[PDB]
Amino acid sequence: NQVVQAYNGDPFVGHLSTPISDSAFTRTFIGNLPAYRKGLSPILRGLEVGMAHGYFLIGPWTLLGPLRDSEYQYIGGLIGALALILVATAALSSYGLVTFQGEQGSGDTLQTADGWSQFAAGFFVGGMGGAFVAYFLLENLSVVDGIFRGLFN
Amino acid sequence: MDGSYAASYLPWILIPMVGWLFPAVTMGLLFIHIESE
């Protein structure tokens, strides 16, 4: 009833097949994230990765920021999130320029210069879009509260 | 929909999730599943 085998039946690779690293749920979940999902073009997986992080980065400066005790509470959070997504996409494109210069194959469409460039473009679009949509929900928070409770219905 | 009871924000977040996220996620996963291979 052993639950920790070696990774993929290979006992000399440096990995164990633990219930977290190599379970069925982990295979179906980690293997279906945009970074690992099958058949996607790099632009759509970069777009889906980007929105999940733009929507995330709005919060930390919105609730904990130099502007959190003023009337421009959400604008400061949005400005910080755009700064972070800008430097994130600059880092992503610099990584693409650096890593993928020697010619490699096309076994994975993401680990190539065109693929990583598409991933960086999608990450930028998704990140700034997610940041602005979280800003738009937060700025119009009275509206969202009223429509979820039924103050206008 | 005011909530007099304890944790009135909890239905505020759980009616969208059980109404949309649970159906959209469950039908999305089942649509990938019943049509796989």
């Binding site: 749920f25 | 009871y5 944790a7």
Partner: peptide, 30 residues
């Protein structure tokens, strides 16, 4: 009445039948 944190305590307790129901249903699927 009832407390605010008793409801969240009930939710995090019921997270355990969620995990065990998921694993039982997965094991029935075999």
């Amino acid at each position: 009445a009832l407390s605010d944190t008793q409801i969240l305590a009930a939710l995090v307790v019921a997270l355990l039948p969620a995990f065990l129901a998921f694993r039982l249903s997965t094991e029935l699927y075999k």
